[PDB]
Amino acid sequence: ANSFLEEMKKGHLERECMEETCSYEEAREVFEDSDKTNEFWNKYKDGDQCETSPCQNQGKCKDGLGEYTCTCLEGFEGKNCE
Amino acid sequence: DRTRYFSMWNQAVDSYDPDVRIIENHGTEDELPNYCFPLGGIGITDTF
Ligand SMILES: [Ca+2]
Ligand SMILES: [Ca+2]
Ligand SMILES: [Ca+2]
Numbered sequence: 001a002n003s004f005l006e007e008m009k010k011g012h013l014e015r016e017c018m019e020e021t022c023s024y025e026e027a028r029e030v031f032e033d034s035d036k037t038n039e040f041w042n043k044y045k046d047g048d049q050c051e052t053s054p055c056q057n058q059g060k061c062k063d064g065l066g067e068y069t070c071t072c073l074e075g076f077e078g079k080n081c082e
Numbered sequence: 083d084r085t086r087y088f089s090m091w092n093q094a095v096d097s098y099d100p101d102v103r104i105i106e107n108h109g110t111e112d113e114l115p116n117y118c119f120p121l122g123g124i125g126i127t128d129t130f
């Protein structure tokens with residue numbers, strides 16, 4: 001993950017953030033983008049969480065570090081649009 | 083004298099260095115380690 005050269009060479013996602021802990025930034029360095037910085041790094045150890053689409057009734061998903069947000073449309077709500 | 087040289091007669095006797103044939107080895111002076119550095123000096127950095 002870290003070394004004298006692991007973080008001195010070119011930043012590639014096919015290198016640093018994959019086979020250790022991927023603590024931080026090494027998922028942001030590759031892209032230079034703090035938008036999905038903490039909406040994807042939660043999916044390094046335990047697997048994805050929105051791939052099941054818990055929200056039904058045409059509701060979008062949002063991943064948080066422990067709980068899932070389900071955006072349901074006007075007049076629709078719920079923990080999973082439930 | 084034979085030490086000095088003259089061109090037209092090819093005046094030069096073959097000579098061998100003294101220390102080459104007989105070595106007087108004494109080591110060196112190695113009390114300071116020599117360091118090379120990155121072209122920008124400071125190698126790696128983090129974002130702050
Ligand atoms: Ca690596
Ligand atoms: Ca990176
Ligand atoms: Ca990295």
Ligand SMILES: [Ca+2]
Binds near residue numbers: 026
């Ligand atoms: Ca870095």
